[PDB]
């Protein structure tokens, strides 16, 4: 996260770190949506241009974390993957359209002060909250700059941007399964997700029921925090039929 701040303890208890087994490293962000299901970006698991195609046994999921590198004994929970599910229409060749994946844990994770699932939006939550100017929150242990690494989980609040402004900021084809967020060069405020934050959550706190909802998944940006560029997020509600199909079937 660029131009963010340290998260408070238990501020984002649905935050999940995707961790490579060998060599031991941060791969991506992710989020806890139930005691056995974790949501992330499909590109965190499959990205043929970078020779990335992970299997369940290559990874671990670390839940309840605050420190990036430290093993948070009695706080974090490390989980193994039972199965990875990637959206069948995830477009890795062009624009990362439908950049979503689910991971089922081998065993349920126990909830605590530091571990708790986020809500997924329904149609009414999405219509109410996904409006230009409305701010969401992005969290992650990714790079602090485009060109180091944080000691603890970082947080940044960013406004959703009008579809024409998102489209006009890039040469990439933007779809209805994406939304963009961040400040305009003239707004005098900054911030963005960056490498290592991908797959993490973009959340909003409903003013109707005071619950946090994950509206987006950190997907991509042309670099990080560049003036006139914006961060692109997978539109979670638009892919809810697929999420529900996977959780219902397996």
């Amino acid at each position: 996260i660029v131009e963010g701040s340290d998260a408070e303890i238990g501020m984002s208890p649905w935050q999940v770190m995707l961790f490579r087994k060998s060599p031991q490293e941060l791969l991506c962000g992710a989020s806890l949506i139930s005691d056995r299901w974790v949501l992330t970006a499909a590109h965190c698991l499959l990205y043929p241009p970078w020779d990335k195609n992970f299997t369940e046994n290559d990874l671990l999921v670390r839940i309840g974390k605050h420190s990036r590198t430290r093993y948070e004994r009695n706080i974090e929970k490390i989980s193994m993957l039972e199965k990875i599910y990637i959206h069948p229409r995830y477009n890795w060749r062009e624009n990362l359209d439908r950049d979503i994946a689910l991971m089922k844990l081998k065993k349920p994770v126990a909830f605590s002060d530091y571990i708790h699932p986020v809500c997924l939006p329904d149609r009414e939550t999405a219509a109410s909250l996904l409006q230009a100017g409305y701010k969401g929150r992005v969290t992650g242990w990714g790079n602090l700059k485009e060109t180091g690494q944080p000691s603890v989980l970082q947080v940044v609040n960013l406004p959703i941007v009008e579809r024409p402004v998102c489209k006009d900021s890039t040469r990439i084809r933007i779809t209805d399964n994406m939304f963009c967020a961040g400040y305009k060069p003239d707004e005098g405020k900054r911030g963005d997700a960056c490498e290592g934050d991908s797959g993490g959550p973009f959340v909003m706190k409903s003013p109707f029921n005071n619950r946090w909802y994950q509206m987006g998944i950190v997907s991509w940006g042309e670099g990080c925090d560049r003036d006139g560029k914006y961060g692109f997020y997978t539109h979670v509600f638009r892919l809810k039929k697929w999420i529900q199909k996977v959780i219902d079937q397996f």
């Binding site: 701040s5 303890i9 208890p13 708790h116 986020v118 809500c119 100017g133 409305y134 701010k135 005071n210």
Partner: peptide, 27 residues
């Protein structure tokens, strides 16, 4: 049924340092 409610915040009626910035944007 208990999704999106944080033990250290919503469950104790404590607010985090910047959630008010989100609420103020929801015009």
């Amino acid at each position: 049924a208990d999704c999106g409610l944080r033990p250290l915040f919503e469950k104790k009626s404590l607010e985090d340092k910047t959630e008010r910035e989100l609420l103020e944007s929801y015009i």
